[PDB]
Amino acid sequence: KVFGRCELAAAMKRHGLDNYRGYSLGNWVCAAKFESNFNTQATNRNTDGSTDYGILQINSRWWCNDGRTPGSRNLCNIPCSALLSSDITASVNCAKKIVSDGNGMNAWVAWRNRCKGTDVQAWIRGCRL
Ligand SMILES: [Cl-]
Ligand SMILES: [Cl-]
Ligand code: NA
Question: C-type lysozyme domain spans which residues?
């Protein structure tokens, strides 16, 4: 599913991401935009052979099992394919574990490089939340 900007803001808010660990909703929407262009089916392969899955491009090296990333952890205890669902619940619940692990949203390279220090509230401007 490809989300609209406000549709995804609303879904993330309902799933408890607004101000989760102090990150306002605009941060999460901005990260989703540049990680996946709001497409839950996005996948990208990494140089180390791991793969990034879903709207928040969660990596199979640490967070999910895709059956082809040798020696990887599965810290969200989910198959990586569950992260590609039109239902964002699994991606959100895993992202909450990621953002709580010490490095906050810096775990998402695109957030650090394209959202951090910008006016992220602009990503939810106009939405009825
Ligand atoms: Cl915001
Ligand atoms: Cl980047
Ligand atoms: Na959803």
Answer: 1-129
